[PDB]
Amino acid sequence: HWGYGKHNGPEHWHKDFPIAKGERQSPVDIDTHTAKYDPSLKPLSVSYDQATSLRILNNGHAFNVEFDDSQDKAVLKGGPLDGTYRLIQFHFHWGSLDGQGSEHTVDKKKYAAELHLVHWNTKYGDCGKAVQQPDGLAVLGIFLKVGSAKPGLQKVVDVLDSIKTKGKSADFTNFDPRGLLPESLDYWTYPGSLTTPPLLESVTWIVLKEPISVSSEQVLKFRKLNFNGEGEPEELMVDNWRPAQPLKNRQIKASFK
Ligand SMILES: Nc1ccc(/N=N/c2ccc(S(N)(=O)=O)cc2)cc1
Ligand SMILES: [Zn+2]
């Protein structure tokens, strides 16, 4: 099945998922000089005060921290969005080396990793329904660079030993995703897709300009995870990122001058 290796990686995905070559695929390179400030964008509202984390899961492609999305508890509103989008999960993409790992790039610069906070439009009732709609999801993307440690990431880092292999999960209650945000909410936005199969073209991307800093030690622990299940040959979970896709007939908008 699909993955990130030579024989099942991004260049193969189109055979099972023809939308891989579609008109609004993600990620993309963000050309900062071509992106235009958009005055029609309303203020972005990240409201994570009542966020209720449940569990952390190694799904064989990344790890997901999952949230209770049965009520308006952690929501994203404003910016390019109409209505209310509920946080369902977050995960990361990262590299084998500090010089790669992000999915989006900025003037072709690759960051060490990229955090995706995944939200679904409450007008569609559940995430499975939302992901089939052109305005179904909003993914808040945050770049990670290697430097000082991110204190708010350490609780994630320290549980990874318990979910080393595909299919393993662990309790992960009382985690506050506000500790993963940078100071500024300045962002770029464009219409795109899921960056993994099924690659559905249902995502409003909101990519923050300011990266967060994480330590080398923190990212090294991401790289100790396994793509494989328990008792199978070890394949380190690294380079689980899709490269930039053609922008085609899309304009990237900036929230800032
Ligand atoms: N039924 C179904 C199956 C797989 C799904 N995948 N959801 C996605 C969640 C977010 C991402 S991403 N990497 O944030 O674009 C990519 C996949 C979503 C729904
Ligand atoms: Zn992602």
Side-chain angles (χ1 to χ4, degrees):
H1 229 263
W2 75 268
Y4 294 97
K6 194 174 285 177
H7 302 287
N8 67 356
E11 305 315 312
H12 292 274
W13 295 349
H14 74 100
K15 291 176 280 171
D16 285 315
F17 306 94
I19 203 174
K21 295 177 178 282
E23 295 300 301
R24 58 174 276 192
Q25 288 290 290
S26 295
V28 299
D29 181 56
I30 299 165
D31 190 283
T32 63
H33 289 293
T34 301
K36 199 189 177 188
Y37 170 70
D38 187 344
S40 76
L41 295 170
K42 297 180 177 176
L44 187 70
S45 174
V46 183
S47 296
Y48 288 172
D49 182 58
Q50 296 288 308
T52 298
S53 65
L54 268 42
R55 196 181 71 148
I56 190 171
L57 170 72
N58 179 335
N59 64 20
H61 316 282
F63 64 86
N64 290 355
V65 173
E66 298 164 354
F67 289 78
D68 176 11
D69 65 342
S70 64
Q71 298 188 260
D72 273 359
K73 277 195 187 178
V75 299
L76 185 65
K77 300 180 77 175
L81 306 175
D82 298 329
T84 304
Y85 287 69
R86 280 191 201 163
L87 179 64
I88 180 165
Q89 55 107 329
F90 72 77
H91 60 274
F92 304 81
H93 307 262
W94 64 91
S96 52
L97 306 157
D98 294 353
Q100 65 200 53
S102 68
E103 297 209 300
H104 295 88
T105 57
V106 179
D107 298 332
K108 302 297 177 84
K109 178 186 171 67
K110 297 171 168 84
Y111 286 88
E114 186 173 330
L115 164 60
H116 289 162
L117 294 130
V118 180
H119 312 74
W120 57 273
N121 193 329
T122 59
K123 80 185 267 212
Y124 300 121
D126 66 52
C127 195
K129 181 149 140 254
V131 77
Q132 309 179 54
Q133 311 302 329
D135 63 343
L137 297 199
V139 184
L140 181 58
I142 302 177
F143 296 117
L144 281 61
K145 66 184 278 174
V146 176
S148 303
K150 190 70 166 174
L153 183 61
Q154 195 55 37
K155 281 181 185 292
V156 171
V157 168
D158 287 327
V159 82
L160 297 182
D161 277 331
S162 73
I163 59 154
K164 183 177 177 176
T165 53
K166 180 176 181 183
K168 291 196 166 285
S169 69
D171 188 284
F172 205 68
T173 49
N174 307 108
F175 179 80
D176 186 353
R178 291 176 290 183
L180 299 176
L181 306 176
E183 284 175 7
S184 180
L185 296 177
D186 287 350
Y187 65 86
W188 297 284
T189 185
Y190 74 98
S193 75
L194 304 180
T195 69
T196 64
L199 300 167
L200 295 168
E201 289 181 335
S202 53
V203 182
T204 299
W205 277 96
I206 299 169
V207 176
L208 301 189
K209 178 183 182 173
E210 186 172 12
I212 61 170
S213 290
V214 303
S215 67
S216 60
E217 293 86 353
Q218 288 178 319
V219 72
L220 281 159
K221 292 184 178 188
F222 284 19
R223 300 187 188 125
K224 291 181 80 73
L225 291 163
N226 280 190
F227 285 129
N228 55 282
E230 186 182 3
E232 292 170 10
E234 180 167 48
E235 190 70 53
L236 295 179
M237 186 181 278
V238 294
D239 293 316
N240 60 345
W241 49 278
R242 191 190 197 191
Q245 300 300 303
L247 191 59
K248 301 189 164 170
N249 189 35
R250 293 180 287 178
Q251 258 270 60
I252 300 179
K253 302 296 181 181
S255 76
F256 58 95
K257 306 178 201 290

PDB file of all heavy atoms in Angstrom, residues 152-177:
ATOM      1  N   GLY A 152       6.201  23.142  25.289  1.00  0.00           N
ATOM      2  CA  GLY A 152       4.881  22.565  25.052  1.00  0.00           C
ATOM      3  C   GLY A 152       4.855  21.309  24.199  1.00  0.00           C
ATOM      4  O   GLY A 152       3.828  20.635  24.134  1.00  0.00           O
ATOM      5  N   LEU A 153       5.963  21.002  23.524  1.00  0.00           N
ATOM      6  CA  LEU A 153       6.090  19.777  22.738  1.00  0.00           C
ATOM      7  C   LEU A 153       6.598  18.589  23.553  1.00  0.00           C
ATOM      8  O   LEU A 153       6.436  17.447  23.137  1.00  0.00           O
ATOM      9  CB  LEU A 153       7.026  20.015  21.549  1.00  0.00           C
ATOM     10  CG  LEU A 153       7.250  18.881  20.536  1.00  0.00           C
ATOM     11  CD1 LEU A 153       5.956  18.458  19.853  1.00  0.00           C
ATOM     12  CD2 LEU A 153       8.305  19.288  19.519  1.00  0.00           C
ATOM     13  N   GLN A 154       7.217  18.838  24.704  1.00  0.00           N
ATOM     14  CA  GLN A 154       7.930  17.771  25.401  1.00  0.00           C
ATOM     15  C   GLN A 154       7.024  16.612  25.847  1.00  0.00           C
ATOM     16  O   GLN A 154       7.428  15.458  25.762  1.00  0.00           O
ATOM     17  CB  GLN A 154       8.743  18.328  26.571  1.00  0.00           C
ATOM     18  CG  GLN A 154       9.778  17.364  27.126  1.00  0.00           C
ATOM     19  CD  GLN A 154      10.749  16.836  26.087  1.00  0.00           C
ATOM     20  OE1 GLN A 154      11.163  17.557  25.180  1.00  0.00           O
ATOM     21  NE2 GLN A 154      11.122  15.572  26.220  1.00  0.00           N
ATOM     22  N   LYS A 155       5.800  16.910  26.280  1.00  0.00           N
ATOM     23  CA  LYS A 155       4.851  15.847  26.651  1.00  0.00           C
ATOM     24  C   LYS A 155       4.530  14.899  25.485  1.00  0.00           C
ATOM     25  O   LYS A 155       4.340  13.699  25.697  1.00  0.00           O
ATOM     26  CB  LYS A 155       3.575  16.426  27.279  1.00  0.00           C
ATOM     27  CG  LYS A 155       3.782  16.817  28.736  1.00  0.00           C
ATOM     28  CD  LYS A 155       2.523  17.367  29.381  1.00  0.00           C
ATOM     29  CE  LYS A 155       2.796  17.858  30.797  1.00  0.00           C
ATOM     30  NZ  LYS A 155       3.124  16.748  31.739  1.00  0.00           N
ATOM     31  N   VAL A 156       4.496  15.430  24.263  1.00  0.00           N
ATOM     32  CA  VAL A 156       4.353  14.596  23.061  1.00  0.00           C
ATOM     33  C   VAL A 156       5.608  13.737  22.876  1.00  0.00           C
ATOM     34  O   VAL A 156       5.527  12.525  22.708  1.00  0.00           O
ATOM     35  CB  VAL A 156       4.098  15.461  21.799  1.00  0.00           C
ATOM     36  CG1 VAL A 156       4.157  14.625  20.522  1.00  0.00           C
ATOM     37  CG2 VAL A 156       2.761  16.183  21.907  1.00  0.00           C
ATOM     38  N   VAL A 157       6.769  14.381  22.926  1.00  0.00           N
ATOM     39  CA  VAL A 157       8.063  13.704  22.749  1.00  0.00           C
ATOM     40  C   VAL A 157       8.222  12.520  23.710  1.00  0.00           C
ATOM     41  O   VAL A 157       8.668  11.435  23.311  1.00  0.00           O
ATOM     42  CB  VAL A 157       9.238  14.714  22.899  1.00  0.00           C
ATOM     43  CG1 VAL A 157      10.578  14.011  23.011  1.00  0.00           C
ATOM     44  CG2 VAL A 157       9.260  15.668  21.715  1.00  0.00           C
ATOM     45  N   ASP A 158       7.832  12.722  24.964  1.00  0.00           N
ATOM     46  CA  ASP A 158       8.062  11.705  25.998  1.00  0.00           C
ATOM     47  C   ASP A 158       7.129  10.496  25.946  1.00  0.00           C
ATOM     48  O   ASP A 158       7.421   9.478  26.576  1.00  0.00           O
ATOM     49  CB  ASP A 158       8.045  12.348  27.386  1.00  0.00           C
ATOM     50  CG  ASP A 158       9.292  13.171  27.658  1.00  0.00           C
ATOM     51  OD1 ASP A 158      10.384  12.812  27.160  1.00  0.00           O
ATOM     52  OD2 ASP A 158       9.183  14.180  28.371  1.00  0.00           O
ATOM     53  N   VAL A 159       6.029  10.591  25.200  1.00  0.00           N
ATOM     54  CA  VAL A 159       5.120   9.457  25.033  1.00  0.00           C
ATOM     55  C   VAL A 159       5.452   8.610  23.792  1.00  0.00           C
ATOM     56  O   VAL A 159       4.923   7.509  23.643  1.00  0.00           O
ATOM     57  CB  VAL A 159       3.642   9.934  25.035  1.00  0.00           C
ATOM     58  CG1 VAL A 159       3.202  10.464  23.680  1.00  0.00           C
ATOM     59  CG2 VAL A 159       2.700   8.830  25.498  1.00  0.00           C
ATOM     60  N   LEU A 160       6.329   9.102  22.913  1.00  0.00           N
ATOM     61  CA  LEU A 160       6.611   8.413  21.643  1.00  0.00           C
ATOM     62  C   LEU A 160       7.220   7.022  21.801  1.00  0.00           C
ATOM     63  O   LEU A 160       6.967   6.156  20.964  1.00  0.00           O
ATOM     64  CB  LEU A 160       7.498   9.266  20.725  1.00  0.00           C
ATOM     65  CG  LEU A 160       6.895  10.592  20.249  1.00  0.00           C
ATOM     66  CD1 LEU A 160       7.858  11.304  19.312  1.00  0.00           C
ATOM     67  CD2 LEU A 160       5.547  10.402  19.573  1.00  0.00           C
ATOM     68  N   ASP A 161       7.992   6.808  22.870  1.00  0.00           N
ATOM     69  CA  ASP A 161       8.517   5.473  23.205  1.00  0.00           C
ATOM     70  C   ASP A 161       7.423   4.416  23.375  1.00  0.00           C
ATOM     71  O   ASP A 161       7.668   3.234  23.121  1.00  0.00           O
ATOM     72  CB  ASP A 161       9.373   5.510  24.490  1.00  0.00           C
ATOM     73  CG  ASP A 161      10.808   5.953  24.241  1.00  0.00           C
ATOM     74  OD1 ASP A 161      11.347   5.719  23.136  1.00  0.00           O
ATOM     75  OD2 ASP A 161      11.413   6.525  25.174  1.00  0.00           O
ATOM     76  N   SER A 162       6.236   4.837  23.816  1.00  0.00           N
ATOM     77  CA  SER A 162       5.106   3.928  24.014  1.00  0.00           C
ATOM     78  C   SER A 162       4.288   3.648  22.750  1.00  0.00           C
ATOM     79  O   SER A 162       3.410   2.790  22.780  1.00  0.00           O
ATOM     80  CB  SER A 162       4.182   4.460  25.113  1.00  0.00           C
ATOM     81  OG  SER A 162       3.444   5.579  24.664  1.00  0.00           O
ATOM     82  N   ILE A 163       4.553   4.375  21.658  1.00  0.00           N
ATOM     83  CA  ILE A 163       3.860   4.143  20.384  1.00  0.00           C
ATOM     84  C   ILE A 163       4.853   3.993  19.229  1.00  0.00           C
ATOM     85  O   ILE A 163       4.659   4.549  18.141  1.00  0.00           O
ATOM     86  CB  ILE A 163       2.805   5.242  20.088  1.00  0.00           C
ATOM     87  CG1 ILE A 163       3.434   6.643  20.026  1.00  0.00           C
ATOM     88  CG2 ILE A 163       1.703   5.217  21.140  1.00  0.00           C
ATOM     89  CD1 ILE A 163       2.642   7.602  19.160  1.00  0.00           C
ATOM     90  N   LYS A 164       5.906   3.213  19.462  1.00  0.00           N
ATOM     91  CA  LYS A 164       7.006   3.112  18.507  1.00  0.00           C
ATOM     92  C   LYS A 164       6.562   2.609  17.138  1.00  0.00           C
ATOM     93  O   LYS A 164       7.040   3.092  16.116  1.00  0.00           O
ATOM     94  CB  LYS A 164       8.121   2.206  19.055  1.00  0.00           C
ATOM     95  CG  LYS A 164       9.334   2.112  18.143  1.00  0.00           C
ATOM     96  CD  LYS A 164      10.429   1.267  18.770  1.00  0.00           C
ATOM     97  CE  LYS A 164      11.613   1.108  17.838  1.00  0.00           C
ATOM     98  NZ  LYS A 164      12.722   0.361  18.492  1.00  0.00           N
ATOM     99  N   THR A 165       5.644   1.651  17.129  1.00  0.00           N
ATOM    100  CA  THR A 165       5.300   0.918  15.923  1.00  0.00           C
ATOM    101  C   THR A 165       3.843   1.133  15.499  1.00  0.00           C
ATOM    102  O   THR A 165       2.978   1.527  16.299  1.00  0.00           O
ATOM    103  CB  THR A 165       5.596  -0.584  16.108  1.00  0.00           C
ATOM    104  OG1 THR A 165       4.960  -1.058  17.303  1.00  0.00           O
ATOM    105  CG2 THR A 165       7.111  -0.824  16.196  1.00  0.00           C
ATOM    106  N   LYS A 166       3.601   0.869  14.218  1.00  0.00           N
ATOM    107  CA  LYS A 166       2.301   1.045  13.578  1.00  0.00           C
ATOM    108  C   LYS A 166       1.185   0.322  14.320  1.00  0.00           C
ATOM    109  O   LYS A 166       1.312  -0.868  14.641  1.00  0.00           O
ATOM    110  CB  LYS A 166       2.364   0.520  12.141  1.00  0.00           C
ATOM    111  CG  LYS A 166       1.068   0.637  11.351  1.00  0.00           C
ATOM    112  CD  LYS A 166       1.267   0.184   9.918  1.00  0.00           C
ATOM    113  CE  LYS A 166      -0.015   0.313   9.114  1.00  0.00           C
ATOM    114  NZ  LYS A 166       0.148  -0.190   7.721  1.00  0.00           N
ATOM    115  N   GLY A 167       0.098   1.043  14.583  1.00  0.00           N
ATOM    116  CA  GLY A 167      -1.058   0.493  15.288  1.00  0.00           C
ATOM    117  C   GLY A 167      -1.057   0.669  16.798  1.00  0.00           C
ATOM    118  O   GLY A 167      -2.086   0.439  17.436  1.00  0.00           O
ATOM    119  N   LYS A 168       0.078   1.055  17.385  1.00  0.00           N
ATOM    120  CA  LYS A 168       0.133   1.323  18.820  1.00  0.00           C
ATOM    121  C   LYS A 168      -0.485   2.679  19.158  1.00  0.00           C
ATOM    122  O   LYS A 168      -0.270   3.669  18.446  1.00  0.00           O
ATOM    123  CB  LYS A 168       1.568   1.248  19.351  1.00  0.00           C
ATOM    124  CG  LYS A 168       2.141  -0.161  19.354  1.00  0.00           C
ATOM    125  CD  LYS A 168       3.384  -0.268  20.226  1.00  0.00           C
ATOM    126  CE  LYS A 168       3.755  -1.718  20.508  1.00  0.00           C
ATOM    127  NZ  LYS A 168       2.859  -2.375  21.502  1.00  0.00           N
ATOM    128  N   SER A 169      -1.256   2.709  20.242  1.00  0.00           N
ATOM    129  CA  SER A 169      -1.816   3.937  20.788  1.00  0.00           C
ATOM    130  C   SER A 169      -1.587   4.020  22.298  1.00  0.00           C
ATOM    131  O   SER A 169      -1.269   3.017  22.958  1.00  0.00           O
ATOM    132  CB  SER A 169      -3.315   4.045  20.476  1.00  0.00           C
ATOM    133  OG  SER A 169      -4.063   3.073  21.191  1.00  0.00           O
ATOM    134  N   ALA A 170      -1.750   5.223  22.834  1.00  0.00           N
ATOM    135  CA  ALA A 170      -1.610   5.472  24.269  1.00  0.00           C
ATOM    136  C   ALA A 170      -2.529   6.593  24.718  1.00  0.00           C
ATOM    137  O   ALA A 170      -2.864   7.486  23.932  1.00  0.00           O
ATOM    138  CB  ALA A 170      -0.171   5.818  24.604  1.00  0.00           C
ATOM    139  N   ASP A 171      -2.940   6.552  25.985  1.00  0.00           N
ATOM    140  CA  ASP A 171      -3.728   7.640  26.560  1.00  0.00           C
ATOM    141  C   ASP A 171      -2.932   8.925  26.441  1.00  0.00           C
ATOM    142  O   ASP A 171      -1.719   8.938  26.659  1.00  0.00           O
ATOM    143  CB  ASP A 171      -4.051   7.382  28.039  1.00  0.00           C
ATOM    144  CG  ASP A 171      -5.030   8.405  28.617  1.00  0.00           C
ATOM    145  OD1 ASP A 171      -4.614   9.553  28.906  1.00  0.00           O
ATOM    146  OD2 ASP A 171      -6.222   8.069  28.769  1.00  0.00           O
ATOM    147  N   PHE A 172      -3.618  10.005  26.089  1.00  0.00           N
ATOM    148  CA  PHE A 172      -2.969  11.294  25.962  1.00  0.00           C
ATOM    149  C   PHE A 172      -3.968  12.392  26.281  1.00  0.00           C
ATOM    150  O   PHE A 172      -4.313  13.222  25.449  1.00  0.00           O
ATOM    151  CB  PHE A 172      -2.349  11.449  24.567  1.00  0.00           C
ATOM    152  CG  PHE A 172      -1.210  12.420  24.527  1.00  0.00           C
ATOM    153  CD1 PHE A 172      -0.020  12.123  25.179  1.00  0.00           C
ATOM    154  CD2 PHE A 172      -1.319  13.631  23.853  1.00  0.00           C
ATOM    155  CE1 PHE A 172       1.041  13.011  25.157  1.00  0.00           C
ATOM    156  CE2 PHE A 172      -0.254  14.519  23.819  1.00  0.00           C
ATOM    157  CZ  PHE A 172       0.923  14.211  24.482  1.00  0.00           C
ATOM    158  N   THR A 173      -4.439  12.368  27.519  1.00  0.00           N
ATOM    159  CA  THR A 173      -5.383  13.356  28.009  1.00  0.00           C
ATOM    160  C   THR A 173      -4.670  14.583  28.550  1.00  0.00           C
ATOM    161  O   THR A 173      -3.478  14.534  28.863  1.00  0.00           O
ATOM    162  CB  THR A 173      -6.277  12.755  29.107  1.00  0.00           C
ATOM    163  OG1 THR A 173      -5.459  12.078  30.067  1.00  0.00           O
ATOM    164  CG2 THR A 173      -7.260  11.779  28.488  1.00  0.00           C
ATOM    165  N   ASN A 174      -5.415  15.686  28.623  1.00  0.00           N
ATOM    166  CA  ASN A 174      -4.963  16.945  29.225  1.00  0.00           C
ATOM    167  C   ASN A 174      -3.757  17.591  28.545  1.00  0.00           C
ATOM    168  O   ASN A 174      -2.994  18.315  29.186  1.00  0.00           O
ATOM    169  CB  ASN A 174      -4.706  16.751  30.724  1.00  0.00           C
ATOM    170  CG  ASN A 174      -5.894  16.151  31.432  1.00  0.00           C
ATOM    171  OD1 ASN A 174      -5.883  14.989  31.828  1.00  0.00           O
ATOM    172  ND2 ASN A 174      -6.945  16.933  31.553  1.00  0.00           N
ATOM    173  N   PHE A 175      -3.601  17.352  27.241  1.00  0.00           N
ATOM    174  CA  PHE A 175      -2.565  18.030  26.478  1.00  0.00           C
ATOM    175  C   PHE A 175      -3.131  19.311  25.896  1.00  0.00           C
ATOM    176  O   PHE A 175      -4.189  19.288  25.279  1.00  0.00           O
ATOM    177  CB  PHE A 175      -2.023  17.167  25.350  1.00  0.00           C
ATOM    178  CG  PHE A 175      -0.970  17.871  24.559  1.00  0.00           C
ATOM    179  CD1 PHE A 175       0.326  17.940  25.045  1.00  0.00           C
ATOM    180  CD2 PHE A 175      -1.281  18.531  23.370  1.00  0.00           C
ATOM    181  CE1 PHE A 175       1.304  18.622  24.353  1.00  0.00           C
ATOM    182  CE2 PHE A 175      -0.301  19.216  22.672  1.00  0.00           C
ATOM    183  CZ  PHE A 175       0.992  19.258  23.163  1.00  0.00           C
ATOM    184  N   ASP A 176      -2.398  20.411  26.070  1.00  0.00           N
ATOM    185  CA  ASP A 176      -2.844  21.738  25.658  1.00  0.00           C
ATOM    186  C   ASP A 176      -2.151  22.131  24.350  1.00  0.00           C
ATOM    187  O   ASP A 176      -0.967  22.473  24.357  1.00  0.00           O
ATOM    188  CB  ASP A 176      -2.524  22.750  26.764  1.00  0.00           C
ATOM    189  CG  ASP A 176      -3.077  24.140  26.477  1.00  0.00           C
ATOM    190  OD1 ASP A 176      -3.597  24.390  25.366  1.00  0.00           O
ATOM    191  OD2 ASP A 176      -2.987  24.998  27.379  1.00  0.00           O
ATOM    192  N   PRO A 177      -2.888  22.110  23.222  1.00  0.00           N
ATOM    193  CA  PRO A 177      -2.238  22.448  21.945  1.00  0.00           C
ATOM    194  C   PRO A 177      -1.828  23.921  21.789  1.00  0.00           C
ATOM    195  O   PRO A 177      -1.066  24.239  20.875  1.00  0.00           O
ATOM    196  CB  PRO A 177      -3.283  22.050  20.900  1.00  0.00           C
ATOM    197  CG  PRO A 177      -4.582  22.178  21.606  1.00  0.00           C
ATOM    198  CD  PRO A 177      -4.310  21.770  23.029  1.00  0.00           C
TER     199      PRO A 177
END
